Amino acid sequence: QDEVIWQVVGHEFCSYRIKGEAQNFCRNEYNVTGLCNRQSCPLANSRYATVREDNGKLYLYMKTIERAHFPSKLWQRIKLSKNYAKALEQIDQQLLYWPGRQIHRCKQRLTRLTQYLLKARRLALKHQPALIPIKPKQAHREASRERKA
Amino acid sequence: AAARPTVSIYNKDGSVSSETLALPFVFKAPIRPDLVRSVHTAVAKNKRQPYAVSEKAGGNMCRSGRMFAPTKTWRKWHVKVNQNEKRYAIASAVAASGVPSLLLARGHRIEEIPEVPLVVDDAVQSFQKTKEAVALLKEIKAYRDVIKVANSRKLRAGKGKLRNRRHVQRRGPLVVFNEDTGIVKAFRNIPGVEIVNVRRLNLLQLAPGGHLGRFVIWTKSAFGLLDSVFGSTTEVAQLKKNYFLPENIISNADVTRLINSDEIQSIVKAAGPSRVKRAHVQKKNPLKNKAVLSRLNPYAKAYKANVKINSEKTPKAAGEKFLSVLHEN
Amino acid sequence: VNIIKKRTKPFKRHQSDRFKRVGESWRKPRGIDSCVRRRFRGTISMPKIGYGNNKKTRYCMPNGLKAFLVRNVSDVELLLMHNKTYAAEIAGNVSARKRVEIVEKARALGVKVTNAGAKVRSQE
Amino acid sequence: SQRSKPASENVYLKLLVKLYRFLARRTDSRFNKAILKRLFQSKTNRPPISISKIAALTSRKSASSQNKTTVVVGTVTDDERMLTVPKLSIAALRFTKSARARILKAGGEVLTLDQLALRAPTGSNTVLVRGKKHA
RNA sequence: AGCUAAAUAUUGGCGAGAGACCGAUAGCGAACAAGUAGAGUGAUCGAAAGAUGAAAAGAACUUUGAAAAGAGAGUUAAAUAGUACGUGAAAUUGCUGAAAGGGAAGCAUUGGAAAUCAGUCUUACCUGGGUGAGAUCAGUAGUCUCUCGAGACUAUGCA
RNA sequence: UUUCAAUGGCCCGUCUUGAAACACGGACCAAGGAGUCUAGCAUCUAUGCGAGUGUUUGGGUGAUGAAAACCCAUCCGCGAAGUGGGAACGCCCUUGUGGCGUGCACCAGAGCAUAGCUGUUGGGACCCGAAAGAUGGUGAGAACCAUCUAGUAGCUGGUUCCUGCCGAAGUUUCCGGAUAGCAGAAACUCAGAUCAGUUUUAUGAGUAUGUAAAAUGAGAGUU
RNA sequence: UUGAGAAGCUCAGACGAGUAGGCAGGCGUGGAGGUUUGUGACGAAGCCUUGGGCGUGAGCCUGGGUCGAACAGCCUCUAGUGCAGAUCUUGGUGGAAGUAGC
RNA sequence: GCGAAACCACAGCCUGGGGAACGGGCCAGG
RNA sequence: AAACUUUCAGCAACGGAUCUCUUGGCUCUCGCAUCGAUGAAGAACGCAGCGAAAUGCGAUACGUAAUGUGAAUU
């Protein structure tokens, strides 16, 4: 299963892969790191855990090998508390006896997703200029009309 | 080994039924991405039409001259593949369609499909209207793939659109049926959906682009007939004379299970470290670094170089015989 | 591990300045009698593997980040875990509407954008 | 098509090489090193062996076949000339359909090289064999 | 001495459908006028040449000039689209601006001067209190979808 | 970026020959422009099956594109009918011993098919460069035209991106070659063994020369 | 300790001329199957530029200007696939030169 | 007034030397 | 200095590359069988719209009759 899956998706063709000069990336939604790796692949790891943000709330998504053949019921999620200390405890207790590498990666994604939510809230309170696109046809027209004017 | 035993059937309203089909042996066949790609490369050349310049046309450098080595029609357009190799690739491409992870890596939006392999009732075989076809695809949540194909319709980049290849798009689900009593015409107008008979499966459809893992929807009758089309490794196929499913050179392809098993981990020697620490990054001179000198020589602590052995009673030792020889001539 | 470049000048093709028909893209000289191939004194340098740069600092911009090409908001969100290693570079053919959406998203993610001021105006 | 890695593109041969790379490195068995070396070899350097030759080599001279597994990194073909097949345990990369059926129907077991690595991870009590390289 | 359908061939003719073909120095010599213009007593030989704009809306009118045209205008989303018409490269030419000038020269290395350009910003973090707020908090009441509890909401309270 | 100062610095490509030189080609720019396709043969690799192997002359079949894919009846092509030693067991503190030896070298079939690579032989055959000759006409011996005909240059000129790694010979012997030798690939075995643009010990022969077995270095021998 | 693209990660030492020739890995172009739920009139492609950056390099990304309808990355397939030369072909344009001259 | 063509790698002051012309192109000088 | 020469940049010329386009070519496949003394193929001369270096037509001269479609030609 997983080893055959990786030999196909990891080395022949994955629609989620973005080839880069120094490291390949994975546009899969369930990748914890965002990189194309053997341990980062949600396709090639039947026991996977990730943290994702849904309309301002963070969730711990987990899948087990026993639900691999049921795509609708494959991933299960729990709501992670807004208290960062308790969110770490919930990751620890939901991922009990999982490899420490996977708990390490979910705790890293929880930090970055908590930081992104903090920065997003700080930008909302702040006042920043709107970005006005420059229209080439309008610029050409007003440049020629101005010369005639 | 140790695959899922049975496959559930889904009615036309999208709900699970109480009937299950034993998983056919073809889904246990080895998945051979190298072998599927090679057969696909050859099989995709078998519908090419010849091209060549006119014989009367035309030095290759002179303007309005003759092109060097003019193209000819008797080029090799069609390429042979052993029938067993074609059957191996088709069996390996049916097996890959039963893995949800290979479906996702091929671009199929099967994230809400209820089960893979997806088998529906035989009442689907008699759908007459595209409305019935779309409603079924929406009940089993397989319409996300069709929406993906519709959104992907673009104008082809290049001279291809000058040559009756105006538009490009994605591949949707592949509906496989037993008998056509309306199913083909109900699904053919849906963008990306291809409908094929289970008796004549096409590797150009099971591995589009040479990429394994097409999303396939079977009817109940097509799924039940998969064991006659392909057979097993020990029983011959009924619909292919003297054909057996290929055997694999590995029994349990999970090699991490073998490496990290109690059978093997109980005899291996104690594993050395992972990435090791660097020893002697910098060379330090014992004649300058006194700490390195004490490490190499556990005697420099008590050395006592300048000892005094002479005194004020030095017996100058040079006889008159030697002095006479020295002060001679 | 600050960024060190073994060389900053480009390698120009020999005689590319003399002739307009000859481009400046590097071409390995093949003439045996040519002094550039023989590597005489005073002649122009040639691309050698010794000029290659440190693997750790390779592909890194002067600010220490690597340029990652971005075409929509999906590409920016990819750098959530790598905002200290990569900078987003919007493609040249991305319209000014999508450029705005990319730039606001990159701002929340804490991702540096190399060309965040292109094709847009400001209004405070 | 040798030395560092196999030139073959079969993913399942690459998985077998993965298994015996670990075995050849984390054990002190020259069998695991020998198997790994032969996994890298080309099809020409891995000639097939027959059911008759395996039966002959096991019960050779002193005979005393006992129950040692026969390992060949290659194909085990069938010899239709011989009429009775003994009880043999053979591990091979591939078995033909005739060879596999004859071993199973009147005899013992057919194994793959990963099934062998679980039974004999150090290669103990195995009869490693080769085919005639002279075509 | 004689006849004889079918299976077979088919760069022509009357049509038809295609293409992993060429894309205006290519593909037929010929995308247009093409076996044409033109060349040769003749047999024969034989080109170059595609694109304004959505729409001519193809520039009324005034004015200088013998005229060709120019200049004021005017049309257009655009005339940096005016029929010498999509885009408009290089070689080459003119004018203007700056700099350097005495013959191997251009060029390479290193800096100066002049001109110009690039990105890097303190802002957040931690902590305390006050004030209100709301849920993932209720010694709380309901609904929905999944597998007791997991997500989504709906009221009610803000300890 | 322009310029200045100090230092250096020839014009490329081809051919030549010892490298040259010299003689050739190059006013400038854009576009075009040269190892291609196919039929055999051999090698290597990959893949399928394997004493077999090869569906596509053809038939069946393909409801939606039907020149595809899918299936195969009868033939037929090819193929076939003593020691050393890898590995493993049991003893021995270990070495080592004992039993058991594949492949190969000393004294119980492996092929067929496809694909790729490389070499090679034909087809215009990497491109270009001299007039043949013949057939059929036109005009008036000679001239001119069109096709065979991509009839040709033992040669001339040219032959299009990058980096990395390896790397000659440039000559003994017979005699355009078979060679050898130099440089790589594959198949091996082999330190409890050998090898050397090297020096030795002493005596053999005539300070040199040669010898078997010491010093130094390197793991070596191979097909 | 998370550093399993096992095709990854890591440690150490030595070495670096190169014609013919041999062997690897890459860059770019036209078209094809798949893919990026890809880019595009809020401006695709091309072109220009003493703007900026990346790669030892082939090359690639980007700002500004110009422009006006299509185009690209990745995996694979395919080939009429890369020029400074051929007294190369076609076209354009120079110095000679407002000279020889009419 | 009208109006070419051949030719064109590129610059261009001399004395000596640079062994293969070295020269115009290097070195040392005027 | 100035001139000239040279370099760089801006603008203007010149030129027509590149890109995009395409009622064309090329190639393959499929169906079909139909010239003439009842004057053919080809050539010439006219006709009327024209831009013919094109097309259609034949003194009934862009054709007339008949069957249509049904209100244009430009």
UniProtKB/Swiss-Prot annotation, chain A:
It comes from the Eukaryota. It is found in: Cytoplasm; Nucleus. A motif (Nuclear localization signal) lies at residues 136-141. Belongs to the MAK16 family. This is Protein mak16. The chain holds residues 3 to 151 of 302 of the full protein.
From Swiss-Prot, chain B:
Residues 246-329 are annotated as: C-terminal-extended nuclear localization signal. The eukaryote-specific C-terminal extension harbors a nuclear import signal and delivers the ACL4-uL4/RPL4 complex to the pre-ribosome, triggering uL4 release from ACL4 and incorporation into the 60S ribosomal subunit. InterPro entries: Ribos_uL4_C_dom, Ribosomal_uL4, Ribosomal_uL4_dom_sf, Ribosomal_uL4_euk/arc_CS, Ribosomal_uL4_euk/arch. Component of the ribosome, a large ribonucleoprotein complex responsible for the synthesis of proteins in the cell. The small ribosomal subunit (SSU) binds messenger RNAs (mRNAs) and translates the encoded message by selecting cognate aminoacyl-transfer RNA (tRNA) molecules. The large subunit (LSU) contains the ribosomal catalytic site termed the peptidyl transferase center (PTC), which catalyzes the formation of peptide bonds, thereby polymerizing the amino acids delivered by tRNAs into a polypeptide chain. Transmembrane segments: none annotated. It is found in: Cytoplasm. The lineage of its organism: Eukaryota, Fungi, Dikarya, Ascomycota, Taphrinomycotina. The keyword Ion transport does not apply. One of its GO terms (biological process) is cytoplasmic translation. Belongs to the universal ribosomal protein uL4 family. GO terms for molecular function: RNA binding; structural constituent of ribosome. One of its GO terms (cellular component) is cytosol. Keywords: Cytoplasm, Ribonucleoprotein, Ribosomal protein. This is Large ribosomal subunit protein uL4B.
Curated annotation (Swiss-Prot), chain C:
Component of the large ribosomal subunit (LSU). Mature yeast ribosomes consist of a small (40S) and a large (60S) subunit. The 40S small subunit contains 1 molecule of ribosomal RNA (18S rRNA) and at least 33 different proteins. The large 60S subunit contains 3 rRNA molecules (25S, 5.8S and 5S rRNA) and at least 46 different proteins. Keywords: Cytoplasm, Nucleus, Phosphoprotein, Ribonucleoprotein, Ribosomal protein. PANTHER family: 60S RIBOSOMAL PROTEIN L32 AND DNA-DIRECTED RNA POLYMERASE II, SUBUNIT N (PTHR23413), RIBOSOMAL PROTEIN L32 (PTHR23413:SF1). Its main location: cytoplasm. The gene is rpl3202. SUPFAM superfamilies: Ribosomal protein L32e. This is Large ribosomal subunit protein eL32A. Component of the ribosome, a large ribonucleoprotein complex responsible for the synthesis of proteins in the cell. The small ribosomal subunit (SSU) binds messenger RNAs (mRNAs) and translates the encoded message by selecting cognate aminoacyl-transfer RNA (tRNA) molecules. The large subunit (LSU) contains the ribosomal catalytic site termed the peptidyl transferase center (PTC), which catalyzes the formation of peptide bonds, thereby polymerizing the amino acids delivered by tRNAs into a polypeptide chain. There are 2 genes for eL32 in S.pombe. GO terms for molecular function: structural constituent of ribosome. One of its GO terms (biological process) is cytoplasmic translation. CDD domains: Ribosomal_L32_L32e. It is found in: Cytoplasm; Nucleus.
UniProtKB/Swiss-Prot annotation, chain D:
One of its GO terms (biological process) is cytoplasmic translation. It comes from the Eukaryota. Its main location: cytoplasm. GO terms for molecular function: RNA binding; structural constituent of ribosome. It is found in: Cytoplasm. One of its GO terms (cellular component) is cytosol. The modification Phosphoserine is found at S4, S52, S124. Keywords: Cytoplasm, Phosphoprotein, Ribonucleoprotein, Ribosomal protein. The modification Phosphothreonine is found at T75, T77, T122, T126. Component of the ribosome, a large ribonucleoprotein complex responsible for the synthesis of proteins in the cell. The small ribosomal subunit (SSU) binds messenger RNAs (mRNAs) and translates the encoded message by selecting cognate aminoacyl-transfer RNA (tRNA) molecules. The large subunit (LSU) contains the ribosomal catalytic site termed the peptidyl transferase center (PTC), which catalyzes the formation of peptide bonds, thereby polymerizing the amino acids delivered by tRNAs into a polypeptide chain. Belongs to the eukaryotic ribosomal protein eL18 family. There are 2 genes for eL18 in S.pombe. Component of the large ribosomal subunit (LSU). Mature yeast ribosomes consist of a small (40S) and a large (60S) subunit. The 40S small subunit contains 1 molecule of ribosomal RNA (18S rRNA) and at least 33 different proteins. The large 60S subunit contains 3 rRNA molecules (25S, 5.8S and 5S rRNA) and at least 46 different proteins. eL18 interacts with NAP1. This is Large ribosomal subunit protein eL18A.
